[PDB]
Enzyme design. Structure first.
Site, short mmCIF file in Angstrom:
data_model
loop_
_atom_site.label_atom_id
_atom_site.label_comp_id
_atom_site.label_asym_id
_atom_site.label_seq_id
_atom_site.Cartn_x
_atom_site.Cartn_y
_atom_site.Cartn_z
N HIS A 68 0.83 -1.19 0.00
CA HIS A 68 0.00 0.00 0.00
C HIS A 68 0.87 1.25 0.00
N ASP A 87 7.53 21.13 -27.86
CA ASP A 87 7.45 19.83 -27.20
C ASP A 87 8.55 19.76 -26.12
N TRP A 94 7.05 0.12 4.31
CA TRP A 94 7.53 0.80 3.12
C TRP A 94 8.87 1.47 3.37
N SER A 129 12.56 8.25 -12.39
CA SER A 129 12.43 9.54 -11.72
C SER A 129 13.58 10.47 -12.08
N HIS A 183 12.42 12.38 3.53
CA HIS A 183 11.66 13.60 3.73
C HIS A 183 11.67 14.47 2.47
N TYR A 207 8.26 16.25 0.11
CA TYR A 207 8.13 17.54 -0.56
C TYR A 207 8.23 17.44 -2.07
N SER A 227 -1.81 27.05 -7.19
CA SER A 227 -1.61 28.45 -7.56
C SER A 227 -2.29 28.77 -8.89
N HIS A 240 12.46 12.01 11.72
CA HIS A 240 11.96 10.65 11.63
C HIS A 240 12.73 9.68 12.52
N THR A 258 6.17 27.74 4.35
CA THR A 258 4.91 27.06 4.04
C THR A 258 3.72 27.92 4.44
N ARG A 263 1.08 1.74 15.12
CA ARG A 263 0.93 1.53 13.69
C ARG A 263 1.35 0.11 13.31
C1 HEA Z 1 3.46 15.32 1.46
C2 HEA Z 1 3.40 14.70 2.63
C3 HEA Z 1 3.93 15.40 3.83
C4 HEA Z 1 4.08 16.79 4.17
C5 HEA Z 1 3.82 18.12 3.51
C6 HEA Z 1 4.65 16.76 5.53
C7 HEA Z 1 4.95 17.91 6.21
C8 HEA Z 1 5.49 17.96 7.46
N1 HEA Z 1 5.79 16.86 8.22
FE1 HEA Z 1 5.56 14.96 7.73
N2 HEA Z 1 5.32 13.06 7.24
C9 HEA Z 1 4.83 12.55 6.08
C10 HEA Z 1 4.39 13.28 5.02
C11 HEA Z 1 4.39 14.65 5.00
N3 HEA Z 1 4.83 15.49 5.98
C12 HEA Z 1 4.80 11.08 6.09
C13 HEA Z 1 4.29 10.34 4.88
C14 HEA Z 1 5.36 10.67 7.35
C15 HEA Z 1 5.55 9.30 7.94
C16 HEA Z 1 6.56 8.48 7.17
C17 HEA Z 1 6.76 7.25 8.02
O1 HEA Z 1 7.09 7.47 9.21
O2 HEA Z 1 6.67 6.11 7.54
C18 HEA Z 1 5.63 11.98 7.99
C19 HEA Z 1 6.15 12.00 9.24
C20 HEA Z 1 6.46 13.14 9.92
C21 HEA Z 1 7.01 13.02 11.28
C22 HEA Z 1 7.36 11.77 12.03
C23 HEA Z 1 6.55 11.61 13.30
C24 HEA Z 1 6.95 10.26 13.84
O3 HEA Z 1 7.69 9.55 13.13
O4 HEA Z 1 6.57 9.92 14.98
C25 HEA Z 1 7.19 14.42 11.62
C26 HEA Z 1 7.76 15.00 12.85
O5 HEA Z 1 8.69 15.77 12.75
C27 HEA Z 1 6.74 15.21 10.46
C28 HEA Z 1 6.74 16.58 10.45
C29 HEA Z 1 6.30 17.32 9.39
C30 HEA Z 1 6.34 18.80 9.44
C31 HEA Z 1 6.87 19.46 10.68
C32 HEA Z 1 5.80 19.23 8.17
C33 HEA Z 1 5.58 20.58 7.58
O6 HEA Z 1 5.80 20.57 6.17
C34 HEA Z 1 4.18 21.13 7.82
C35 HEA Z 1 4.19 22.61 7.43
C36 HEA Z 1 2.79 23.17 7.33
C37 HEA Z 1 2.24 23.88 8.33
C38 HEA Z 1 3.01 24.15 9.58
C39 HEA Z 1 0.84 24.43 8.17
C40 HEA Z 1 0.81 25.58 7.17
C41 HEA Z 1 1.58 26.73 7.76
C42 HEA Z 1 0.95 27.65 8.52
C43 HEA Z 1 -0.53 27.56 8.74
C44 HEA Z 1 1.72 28.81 9.10
C45 HEA Z 1 1.40 28.97 10.59
C46 HEA Z 1 1.85 27.72 11.30
C47 HEA Z 1 2.83 27.77 12.21
C48 HEA Z 1 3.49 29.08 12.53
C49 HEA Z 1 3.28 26.53 12.92
N4 HEA Z 1 6.29 14.41 9.47
C1 HEA Z 2 -0.22 8.95 -1.15
C2 HEA Z 2 -0.20 7.73 -0.66
C3 HEA Z 2 -1.40 7.18 0.02
C4 HEA Z 2 -2.82 7.25 -0.27
C5 HEA Z 2 -3.72 7.87 -1.30
C6 HEA Z 2 -3.42 6.47 0.84
C7 HEA Z 2 -4.77 6.30 0.94
C8 HEA Z 2 -5.36 5.59 1.94
N1 HEA Z 2 -4.73 4.96 2.97
FE1 HEA Z 2 -2.80 4.90 3.30
N2 HEA Z 2 -0.86 4.82 3.64
C9 HEA Z 2 0.12 5.38 2.91
C10 HEA Z 2 -0.05 6.12 1.78
C11 HEA Z 2 -1.27 6.38 1.23
N3 HEA Z 2 -2.48 5.98 1.70
C12 HEA Z 2 1.45 5.10 3.48
C13 HEA Z 2 2.66 5.66 2.78
C14 HEA Z 2 1.23 4.31 4.66
C15 HEA Z 2 2.21 3.73 5.64
C16 HEA Z 2 2.71 2.40 5.09
C17 HEA Z 2 3.32 1.61 6.22
O1 HEA Z 2 2.79 1.68 7.35
O2 HEA Z 2 4.32 0.91 5.98
C18 HEA Z 2 -0.24 4.18 4.67
C19 HEA Z 2 -0.83 3.48 5.66
C20 HEA Z 2 -2.17 3.31 5.75
C21 HEA Z 2 -2.71 2.50 6.86
C22 HEA Z 2 -1.98 1.87 8.00
C23 HEA Z 2 -1.91 0.36 7.96
C24 HEA Z 2 -0.85 0.06 8.98
O3 HEA Z 2 0.35 0.19 8.68
O4 HEA Z 2 -1.24 -0.37 10.08
C25 HEA Z 2 -4.13 2.62 6.60
C26 HEA Z 2 -5.29 2.05 7.31
O5 HEA Z 2 -5.56 2.54 8.39
C27 HEA Z 2 -4.30 3.39 5.37
C28 HEA Z 2 -5.53 3.65 4.85
C29 HEA Z 2 -5.71 4.38 3.72
C30 HEA Z 2 -7.06 4.63 3.19
C31 HEA Z 2 -8.23 4.05 3.92
C32 HEA Z 2 -6.83 5.43 2.02
C33 HEA Z 2 -7.68 6.03 0.97
O6 HEA Z 2 -8.35 4.95 0.32
C34 HEA Z 2 -8.72 6.97 1.54
C35 HEA Z 2 -9.80 7.22 0.49
C36 HEA Z 2 -9.30 8.00 -0.70
C37 HEA Z 2 -9.40 7.50 -1.94
C38 HEA Z 2 -9.95 6.12 -2.14
C39 HEA Z 2 -8.91 8.29 -3.14
C40 HEA Z 2 -7.54 7.79 -3.58
C41 HEA Z 2 -7.43 7.89 -5.09
C42 HEA Z 2 -6.24 7.84 -5.69
C43 HEA Z 2 -5.00 7.66 -4.86
C44 HEA Z 2 -6.06 7.93 -7.18
C45 HEA Z 2 -5.70 9.35 -7.62
C46 HEA Z 2 -5.39 9.32 -9.09
C47 HEA Z 2 -5.71 10.37 -9.87
C48 HEA Z 2 -6.40 11.55 -9.26
C49 HEA Z 2 -5.38 10.35 -11.33
N4 HEA Z 2 -3.11 3.80 4.90
O1 LIG Z 3 8.06 13.59 6.56
O2 LIG Z 3 7.63 14.91 6.98
CU LIG Z 4 10.00 13.98 7.33
#
Ligand code: HEA
Ligand code: HEA
Ligand SMILES: [O-][O-]
Ligand SMILES: [Cu+2]
Ligand SMILES: CCCCCCCCCCCCCCCCCC(=O)OC[C@H](COP(=O)([O-])OCC(O)COP(=O)([O-])OC[C@@H](COC(=O)CCCCCCCCCCCCCCCCC)OC(=O)CCCCCCCCCCCCCCCCC)OC(=O)CCCCCCCCCCCCCCCCC
Ligand SMILES: CCCCCCCCCCCCCCCCCC(=O)OC[C@H](COP(=O)([O-])OCC(O)COP(=O)([O-])OC[C@@H](COC(=O)CCCCCCCCCCCCCCCCC)OC(=O)CCCCCCCCCCCCCCCCC)OC(=O)CCCCCCCCCCCCCCCCC
Ligand SMILES: CCCCCCCCCCCCCCCCCC(=O)OC[C@H](COP(=O)([O-])OCC(O)COP(=O)([O-])OC[C@@H](COC(=O)CCCCCCCCCCCCCCCCC)OC(=O)CCCCCCCCCCCCCCCCC)OC(=O)CCCCCCCCCCCCCCCCC
Ligand SMILES: CCCCCCCC/C=C\CCCCCCCC(=O)OC[C@H](COP(=O)(O)OCCN)OC(=O)CCCCCCC/C=C\CCCCCCCC
Ligand SMILES: CCCCCCCC/C=C\CCCCCCCC(=O)OC[C@H](COP(=O)(O)OCCN)OC(=O)CCCCCCC/C=C\CCCCCCCC
Ligand SMILES: CCCCCCCC/C=C\CCCCCCCC(=O)OC[C@H](COP(=O)(O)OCCN)OC(=O)CCCCCCC/C=C\CCCCCCCC
Ligand SMILES: CCCCCCCC/C=C\CCCCCCCC(=O)OC[C@H](COP(=O)(O)OCCN)OC(=O)CCCCCCC/C=C\CCCCCCCC
Ligand SMILES: [K+]
Ligand SMILES: [Zn+2]
Lengths: 60, 230, 62, 65, 107, 226, 459, 61, 52
Positions: free
Chosen positions: G60, G90, G125, G153, G228, G232, G243, G278, G303, G428
């Site tokens: 997944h 192109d 993963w 990529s 990480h 992004y 935008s 992380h 951000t 988890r």
């Molecule tokens: C695209 C996906 C995405 C994005 C954008 C982010 C964005 C951020 N993530 Fe991420 N993160 C993940 C995807 C993402 N993350 C995933 C997939 C994991 C788990 C992977 C795994 O463990 O397997 C993860 C895990 C993860 C952890 C691990 C927690 C743990 O392992 O227990 C942490 C902690 O530092 C973290 C922090 C952040 C922070 C601080 C941002 C920042 O970018 C957020 C910034 C945005 C805002 C802050 C809000 C908008 C800003 C404002 C509204 C301004 C005003 C706000 C303030 C002044 C605070 N992320």
């Molecule tokens: C972007 C990546 C992505 C997306 C879309 C999702 C979507 C969803 N995920 Fe996700 N999920 C992950 C990335 C994602 N997940 C990752 C990285 C983990 C951690 C893996 C790990 O633990 O090792 C995780 C783990 C994770 C768990 C944890 C299982 C576990 O480790 O114990 C669960 C269930 O609770 C879950 C549920 C869901 C559900 C219910 C949806 C969705 O079904 C919710 C409903 C939304 C939709 C059905 C729309 C989705 C449609 C598309 C994605 C197609 C888009 C295409 C076009 C627009 C052209 N996800």
């Molecule tokens: O990963 O934030």
């Molecule tokens: Cu990170």
């Protein structure tokens, strides 16, 4: 007013599912024999010969 | 008036190359893998022919585009070596007090640094002649002699080393870093075997690419020598 | 070369006429099966040229 | 030619054969099966049943069914 | 920051006391899915699609100049759906400056 | 132009082996019926025949001298077309910057087709706005909805053809008196004698008029091995 | 032809098509997970087949990240509009563009084939060793897929970078978004390849990096040094789309274009130096933890600037224009949803809070709100905006208020309860859990089945 | 030398500048499609058998 | 240079093609299998693929 009624006449409801008869009743896969339509199939789509088998980009 | 670009509409090498890659995975014999590698070489060479035939478009930006691609690739080569240096230094705290024999700092480093330097001088002379629209036949054969000696020395070192990959992460990192350098040396052979004089001269991307790559590999060996031997 | 360093070929000495070189309609029937095998082998001259220059050094290493 | 002006002209001009759409949906359906079929196969391989009965790995009342 | 073009008061003075702001409709019209005729073949349906492009439409003002369909980005300038080859003639981004040279003028 | 690659050898001159072998018909063909190679060698043979006759140059008018060398006397019609051609070519790989367009002097947008995509950036300084893209179709005086900058499309079209240097030369240049082969022979004997050829093009050209292989050393010149 | 085509716009369509196909497999796996977690007991996976669940969660994650969202937001929309936005005929590298999509498909086939043929086991993963290196051959197959994906990529990144050499207009914000993601890929991928090769060496070449006296924490550094930046690389293209949509639909010029651009550049640099958030619970040095926590909180500044610049784009727009278009609703929903995900990210950024919330479903809900909701909706919104240009039909989406409302409500029913169970706490990557966590797990499960049903109404 | 007689440069894709030779190379590789499918399908069977996945039912019978 | 007429009259008088008939949600469930087992071009392509 209902604007659909203005152009209702142009839209004649269809007879065939997906707009084609069974291939047995008419073979749309074959190239048309009409003069000037050698690059088209009978149903109007481009023939595989024109686009794939003898594509001009390949030297044909 | 003509179009700015002569668009390429179709290509079939991509399918073949991608299938060739799959054969590496879906196979039951290592001989199949050897012959598959030859297929890859052949089709990559066809892609290179397509690049040479694109010269007919007389597009000024083509040289620049290819040159910058090489820059990106070189960057990726540098960053892969960085990852190995990182792997090496992360376990630095467990080195130099284990019951293994690390390499001498006198023999291997000196003859290798002297050898690789001569390789750079040859490539530099090739560049100089390239600038002067001239050619010297003996140059390429000096490269072949240098590569032969490098291969001869590296083979003996590995065979006569008394420590193995499973002895310590130090030994694993030493062997792996040296192998990674060798692979890049072998890739230099792959590139240099086709060196010839082409009369279109400085609009040929091959010449600049070879100069950059050879310098990268030699510079990379300076970093390795300091880390491991000295 | 047909690039800046050279130019076109005079018509007196052109040997690959594009009108005959192209227009591959039904070329397989004109060349036969052995001709198809010949054409495939002849299409890989570039790859053959490379292998003739690449193999010797690898033999030495072996 | 006018027919070649638009990419995927038959589809854009709404003349394409429906089989192309069916294949796309079938391909997606097959992709989905790669998560369900091995689940059933693996369950049977290690248990002898294609799917469990809810809470059959825990103690159940006498009248539970 | 951009705040519109600068206006001098002299340019806001009308030549008649009845001048008001022209009330021309800038709604292009009523549209829906492009509706192809069954009789038309692939070639003639392509012509139909090319004649339904909103980005080829404009509004003509009282003095005969037309304000075209405009967009912030060139993505809205290609035919819809996008053809295989779009910008054969390079789109021209017009920049303005105050520099001039004598050769362009004649006395 | 900056977008063009390096001059070819052909950009300077053509090999004498590309000279048409039927010179007699070449010098009698009308300009509209001469191809690129035929037109190159018609001008070179005729132009060098007059230039290699010093005693006649001072008495020859510039109108006649230009005709012999194949140079087109300029006029407002042809200048306009050539200028717009070169402006189109320049804009292929160069930016499009100029004075603000008004009704009196619209921004001129050259095009071959009936449409060209154009963007308005407004005026200079604070009067500059974000790019507003529009499709400039022929026959309409376009006005930007934001800054009121007037645009207009100019089409390089003439009689079912677009404007090219070849088209401009064919439409406006007029063939003069038919070239006389006696002049070719006379100049040939002037600069080519006793195994010295100081007009190589006229030695080859005279040989072809004679039938190919007649002049000394020409059979050996035409005998190739591959 | 179909497979031979080099047209950049056709290839863009292929990327979207393949993302939906592979996406079906992704969603199915998600349904399996949520069904299992509906109560305590075994529901659809036997206790003797628990290895399958570990494989389901692993695949997944990998598929949704590398084979669905990345090919959709960095391969699909980019390959279709970027050459148009750049007023160029192109893409710079036609043949490379063709092979990239073929490579993605071939790596997908390898992965799914490995499900069918190999023993089904999972290691997450994130493929942490030593667990990843003591597994069966399915792990080897997954590694081949990732490396092959990495090739596609990087070459695609090279392709986009070459647009700077040919762009004939102005570099719009969206173009800047793709270029910076390309830079992030060029710098992060080579490090990933190295660590993946080391995983292979230990799996297949008797290497000893991940056995005693070799530091397993080493992998986590190199992995997350790519990890990480990957999150992004997956979000920045979405920002670029948002935008364009807001400016176009509201007929308002982007406000603070240069600040938007400089915010994207800033996020990239910062995102390249904060990876160890992380690795908070491993036991890093106090000063390291403080550095990473400090720099992680800084990312909110750039951000935040982008979020507020988007808000003013929607403010003040003409009322006469109909605001119920699906693309506009999705773009607005992204701002509302992304703030939730980001704020929770800042909460987990505090390491002391993170000790309690690491490896809990709070982290799940955090990255789902950003990816499963925000990124998906952004891709949908972008495709919807280009419906006329792309030309697809036979769907009822363009004006469907029911779909948007039902999706928003039900997606929140799935992941909002996962924040609660994070303080319950439910770890988890588990399938069985204590009986006192059923309520929230049940509610989320009801949300998952409902969302799937709403996906059928579009046709 | 005549500029208008080289239109094959843009009328024909570079991959097929070689006429029949280039068409033959493509055609030859095309002939290997189904042999590849059988070969790839065999590998799937090999792994499926070696993992004892065919005895799923015989195991519990 | 080729000369073509403005129109051509076909020898047959069968209106084989036209607008789609109104379809329901599950129309594909029967139409798709019908094409596979009843349209020659479909089942000849399937047998060819399976056999080789
Ligand atoms: C695209 C996906 C995405 C994005 C954008 C982010 C964005 C951020 N993530 Fe991420 N993160 C993940 C995807 C993402 N993350 C995933 C997939 C994991 C788990 C992977 C795994 O463990 O397997 C993860 C895990 C993860 C952890 C691990 C927690 C743990 O392992 O227990 C942490 C902690 O530092 C973290 C922090 C952040 C922070 C601080 C941002 C920042 O970018 C957020 C910034 C945005 C805002 C802050 C809000 C908008 C800003 C404002 C509204 C301004 C005003 C706000 C303030 C002044 C605070 N992320
Ligand atoms: C972007 C990546 C992505 C997306 C879309 C999702 C979507 C969803 N995920 Fe996700 N999920 C992950 C990335 C994602 N997940 C990752 C990285 C983990 C951690 C893996 C790990 O633990 O090792 C995780 C783990 C994770 C768990 C944890 C299982 C576990 O480790 O114990 C669960 C269930 O609770 C879950 C549920 C869901 C559900 C219910 C949806 C969705 O079904 C919710 C409903 C939304 C939709 C059905 C729309 C989705 C449609 C598309 C994605 C197609 C888009 C295409 C076009 C627009 C052209 N996800
Ligand atoms: O990963 O934030
Ligand atoms: Cu990170
Ligand atoms: C690729 C080869 C690599 C070999 C590496 C070997 C390393 C060891 C040391 C070798 C020393 C020689 C020089 C090597 C460097 C490269 C030379 C070079 O560039 O030559 C260009 C020269 C001409 O090149 P060009 O491209 O035509 O012209 C380039 C320039 O424009 C014009 O060039 P130029 O005129 O300016 O010349 C540059 C000059 C620069 O070099 C120097 O000046 C260096 C001086 C070093 C002195 C060291 C003491 O080089 C020379 O003058 C080279 C002269 C070579 C003459 C060879 C004649 C044939 C010999 C056959 C021997 C057969 C023996 C059979 C035995 C049988 C027993 C049973 O090339 C040759 O002539 C080819 C040969 C090159 C040298 C090969 C040396 C082999 C040595 C084998 C020794 C075996 C001993 C066995 C003993 C057995 C005991 C029982
Ligand atoms: C996330 C989901 C929800 C999303 C919702 C949101 C969506 C928003 C909108 C998104 C829009 C994106 C952009 C769209 C752009 C569209 C452009 C377009 O249409 O391009 C034209 C393009 C082609 O049109 P064309 O230009 O006319 O092409 C002419 C052909 O090139 C030439 O024509 P031809 O007839 O000569 O064609 C050759 C044909 C010849 O075909 C035939 O002869 C077919 C004969 C009938 C066969 C039927 C299948 C039979 C299956 C039998 C199974 C038996 C199982 C037995 C089990 C027994 C158990 C006991 O095919 C072949 O020979 C090769 C076919 C290969 C592909 C199919 C593969 C199927 C799966 C295979 C699996 C194999 C697994 C092996 C495992 C082995 C392990 C050891 O259209 C398509 O390809 C169709 C696209 C349709 C969908 C478009 C999007 C619509 C909007 C979205 C709707 C929702 C979709 C949701 C996903 C699907 C869910 C399932
Ligand atoms: C003793 C032994 C000694 C040693 C011997 C050593 C020998 C060494 C040999 C080395 C070389 C071997 C390989 C040779 C390759 C030759 C390539 C070549 O030059 O071909 C030219 C040749 C040109 O053909 P042509 O002769 O001019 O005429 C072709 C026809 O007219 C047709 O015209 P067309 O090309 O326009 O039509 C193509 C198209 C026509 O379109 C359609 O069929 C309908 C429209 C599309 C329907 C919707 C499809 C789903 C949406 C996909 C969206 C993304 C597409 C991306 C682009 C396509 C990528 C394939 O449909 C297809 O054929 C494929 C469509 C896409 C299929 C995949 C879609 C996803 C399905 C997922 C299902 C599971 C989940 O290329 C082709 O057309 C065929 C290439 C086939 C390559 C197949 C590679 C498959 C690899 C699969 C994975 C392998 C590992 C696992 C396998 C497990 C099996 C159990
Ligand atoms: C004159 C030339 C000078 C060149 C200087 C280059 C500086 C580049 C530095 C980049 C990374 C800096 C990170 C901060 C310094 C931290 C150093 C440190 O703590 O090293 C040890 C620590 C590992 O120890 P623990 O995990 O605590 O336990 C291990 C138990 N076996 O960190 C590391 O692993 C360091 C890894 C990075 C080294 C390689 C850096 C990049 C090299 C580029 C070469 C070109
Ligand atoms: C590796 C792929 C690199 C792709 C980017 C660089 C491509 C490049 O510059 O190749 C061209 C360049 C020179 O061609 P020109 O005609 O001067 O330039 C092309 C038109 N201007 O070609 C070369 O570098 C020669 C390559 C010869 C050796 C090829 C060996 C292939 C080995 C494959 C092993 C697997
Ligand atoms: C019942 C489950 C859903 C079935 C479904 O919606 O399948 C749709 C899908 C596409 O059909 P249309 O959208 O009608 O395309 C033809 C041209 N209009 O239908 C099929 O693929 C039919 C076969 C489905 C087999 C599923 C197993
Ligand atoms: C983007 C390119 C620049 C990246 C620079 C990243 C440097 C971040 C600095 C983080 C830091 O303080 O490093 C500590 C941290 C280790 O901390 P501890 O395991 O607690 O060990 C400390 C004492 N035993 O250092 C590392 O892990 C450094 C990793 C090397 C990064 C090398 C990047 C190379 C880029 C090319
Ligand atoms: K459970
Ligand atoms: Zn303006």
């Amino acid at each position: 007013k209902s604007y659909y009624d203005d152009f209702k006449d142009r839209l004649k409801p269809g007879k065939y599912t997906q707009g084609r008869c069974p291939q047995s009743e008419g073979d749309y896969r074959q190239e048309s024999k009409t003069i000037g339509r050698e690059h088209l199939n009978d149903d109007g789509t481009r023939s595989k010969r024109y686009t794939v088998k003898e594509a001009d980009a390949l030297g044909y | 008036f003509e179009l700015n670009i002569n668009i390429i509409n179709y290509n079939y090498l991509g399918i073949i190359i991608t299938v060739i890659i799959s054969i590496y995975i879906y196979n039951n014999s290592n001989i199949i893998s050897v012959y598959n590698s030859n297929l890859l070489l052949i089709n990559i060479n066809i892609w290179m022919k397509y690049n040479i035939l694109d010269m007919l478009n007389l597009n000024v930006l083509d040289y620049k585009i290819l040159l910058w691609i090489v820059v990106i690739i070189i960057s990726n080569e540098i960053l892969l070596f960085v990852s190995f240096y990182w792997i090496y230094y992360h376990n630095y705290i467990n080195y130099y007090h284990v019951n293994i024999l690390i390499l001498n700092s006198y023999n291997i480093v000196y003859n290798n640094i002297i050898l690789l330097t001569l390789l750079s001088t040859i490539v530099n002379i090739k560049f100089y002649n390239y600038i002067l629209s001239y050619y010297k036949y003996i140059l390429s054969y000096l490269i072949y002699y240098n590569n032969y000696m490098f291969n001869n020395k590296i083979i003996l070192e590995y065979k006569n080393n008394s420590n193995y990959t499973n002895d310590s992460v130090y030994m694993t990192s030493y062997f792996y870093i040296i192998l990674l350098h060798y692979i890049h040396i072998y890739d230099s052979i792959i590139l240099i075997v086709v060196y010839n004089y082409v009369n279109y001269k400085n609009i040929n991307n091959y010449y600049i690419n070879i100069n950059i790559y050879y310098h990268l590999i030699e510079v990379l060996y300076i970093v390795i020598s300091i880390l491991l031997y000295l | 070369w047909p690039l800046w360093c050279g130019g076109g070929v005079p018509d007196k000495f052109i040997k690959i006429d594009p009108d005959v070189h192209f227009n591959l309609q039904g070329y397989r029937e004109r060349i036969g099966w052995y001709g198809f095998f010949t054409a495939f082998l002849q299409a890989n001259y570039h790859a053959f040229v490379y292998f003739v220059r690449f193999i010797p050094i690898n033999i030495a290493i072996f | 030619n006018l027919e070649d002006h638009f990419d995927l002209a038959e589809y854009m001009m709404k003349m394409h054969n429906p089989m192309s759409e069916y294949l796309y949906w079938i391909a997606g359906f097959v992709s989905g099966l790669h998560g369900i079929l091995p689940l059933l196969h693996s369950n049977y391989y290690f248990s002898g049943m294609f799917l469990p009965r809810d809470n059959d790995n825990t103690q159940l009342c006498d009248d539970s069914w | 920051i951009y705040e519109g073009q600068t206006v001098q008061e002299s340019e806001l003075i009308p030549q008649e006391d009845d001048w008001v702001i022209e009330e021309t409709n800038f709604c292009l019209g009523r549209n829906c899915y492009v509706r192809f005729r069954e009789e038309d073949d692939l070639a003639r349906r392509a012509l139909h699609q090319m004649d339904s492009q909103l980005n080829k439409m404009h509004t003509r003002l009282r003095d005969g100049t037309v304000i075209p369909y405009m967009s912030f980005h060139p993505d809205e300038m290609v035919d819809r759906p996008a053809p295989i080859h779009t910008f054969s003639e390079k789109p021209l981004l017009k920049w303005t400056w105050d520099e001039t040279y004598e050769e362009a003028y004649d006395d | 132009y900056r977008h063009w690659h390096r001059m070819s050898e052909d950009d300077w001159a053509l090999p004498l082996d590309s000279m048409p072998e039927d010179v007699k018909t070449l010098m009698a063909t009308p300009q509209t019926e001469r191809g690129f190679v035929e037109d190159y060698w018609y001008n070179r043979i005729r132009g060098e025949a007059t230039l290699l006759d010093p005693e006649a140059l001072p008495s020859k008018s510039y109108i006649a001298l230009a005709r012999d060398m194949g140079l087109q006397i300029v006029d407002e019609p042809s200048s306009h077309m050539m200028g717009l051609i070169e402006l189109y070519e320049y804009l292929r790989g160069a930016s499009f910057v100029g004075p603000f367009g008004t009704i009196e002097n619209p921004v001129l947008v050259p095009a071959v087709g009936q449409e060209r995509v154009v963007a308005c950036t407004g005026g200079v300084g604070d009067e500059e706005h974000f790019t507003l893209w529009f499709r400039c179709r022929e026959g309409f005086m376009y006005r930007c909805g934001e800054c009121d900058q007037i645009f207009m499309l100019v089409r390089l079209y003439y009689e079912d053809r677009y404007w090219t240097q070849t088209l401009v030369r064919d439409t406006f240049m007029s063939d003069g008196d038919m070239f006389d082969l006696k002049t070719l022979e006379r100049v040939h004997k002037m600069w080519n004698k006793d195994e010295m050829v100081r007009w190589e093009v006229g030695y080859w050209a005279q040989d072809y008029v004679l039938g190919k292989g007649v002049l000394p050393g020409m059979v050996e010149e035409h005998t190739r091995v591959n | 032809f179909y497979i031979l085509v080099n047209n950049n716009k056709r290839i863009g369509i292929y990327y979207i098509k393949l993302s939906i196909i592979i996406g079906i497999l992704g969603i199915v796996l998600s349904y399996i997970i949520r069904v299992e977690l509906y109560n305590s007991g075994n529901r659809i996976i036997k206790y003797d087949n628990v290895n399958y669940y570990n494989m389901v969660i692993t695949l997944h994650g990998l598929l949704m990240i590398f084979y669905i969202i990345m090919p959709g937001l960095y391969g699909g929309i980019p390959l279709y509009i970027l050459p148009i936005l750049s007023v160029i005929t192109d893409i710079v590298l036609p043949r490379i563009n063709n092979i990239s999509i073929i490579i993605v498909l071939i790596s997908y086939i390898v992965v799914i084939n490995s499900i069918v043929i190999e023993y089904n086991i999972g290691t997450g993963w994130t493929l942490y060793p030593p667990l990843s290196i003591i597994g069966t051959v399915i792990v080897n197959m997954i590694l081949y897929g990732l490396i092959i994906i990495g090739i596609s990529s990087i070459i695609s990144a090279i392709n986009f970078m070459n647009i700077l050499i040919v762009i004939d207009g102005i570099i719009y914000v969206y173009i800047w978004s793709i270029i910076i993601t390309s830079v992030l890929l060029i710098i992060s991928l080579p490090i990933l390849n190295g660590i993946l090769l080391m995983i292979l060496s230990d799996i297949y070449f008797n290497s000893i990096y991940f056995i005693l006296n070799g530091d397993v924490v080493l992998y986590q550094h190199l992995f997350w040094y790519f990890g990480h930046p990957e999150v992004y690389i997956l979000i920045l293209p979405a920002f670029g789309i948002i935008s364009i949509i807001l400016s176009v639909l509201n007929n308002k010029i982007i406000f603070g274009m240069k600040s938007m651009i400089l915010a994207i550049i800033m996020i990239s640099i910062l995102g390249s130096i904060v990876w160890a958030h992380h690795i908070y619970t491993v036991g890093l040095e106090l000063d390291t933890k403080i550095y990473f926590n400090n720099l992680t909180l800084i990312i909110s500044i750039p951000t935040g600037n982008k979020i507020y610049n988007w808000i003013i784009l929607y403010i003040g727009s003409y009322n006469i224009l109909y605001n119920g278009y699906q693309s506009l609703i999705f773009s607005i929903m992204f701002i509302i949803i992304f703030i939730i995900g980001g704020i929770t990210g800042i909460i987990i950024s505090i390491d002391i809070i993170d000790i309690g919330l690491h490896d809990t479903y709070y982290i799940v809900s955090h990255f789902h709100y950003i990816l499963s909701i925000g990124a998906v909706i952004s891709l949908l919104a972008g495709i919807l905006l280009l419906k006329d240009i792309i030309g697809y039909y036979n769907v009822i989406i363009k004006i469907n208020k029911y779909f948007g409302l039902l999706l928003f409500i039900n997606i929140n029913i799935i992941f909002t309860p996962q924040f609660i169970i994070g303080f319950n706490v439910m770890p988890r990557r588990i399938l069985e859990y204590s009986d006192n966590i059923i309520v929230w797990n049940l509610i989320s499960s009801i949300g998952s089945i409902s969302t799937i049903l709403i996906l059928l109404s579009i046709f | 030398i005549d500029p208008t007689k080289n239109q094959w440069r843009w009328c024909v894709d570079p991959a097929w500048y070689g006429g029949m030779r280039d068409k033959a190379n493509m055609d030859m590789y095309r002939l290997m499609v189904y042999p590849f499918f059988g070969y790839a399908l065999l590998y799937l069977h090999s792994r499926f058998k070696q993992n004892d996945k065919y005895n799923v039912f015989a195991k519990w019978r | 240079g080729r000369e073509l007429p403005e129109y051509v009259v076909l020898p047959h008088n069968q209106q084989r093609y036209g607008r789609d008939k109104s379809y329901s949600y599950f129309t594909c469930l029967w139409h798709f299998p019908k094409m596979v087992f009843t349209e020659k071009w479909c089942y000849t392509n399937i047998m060819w693929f399976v056999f080789w």
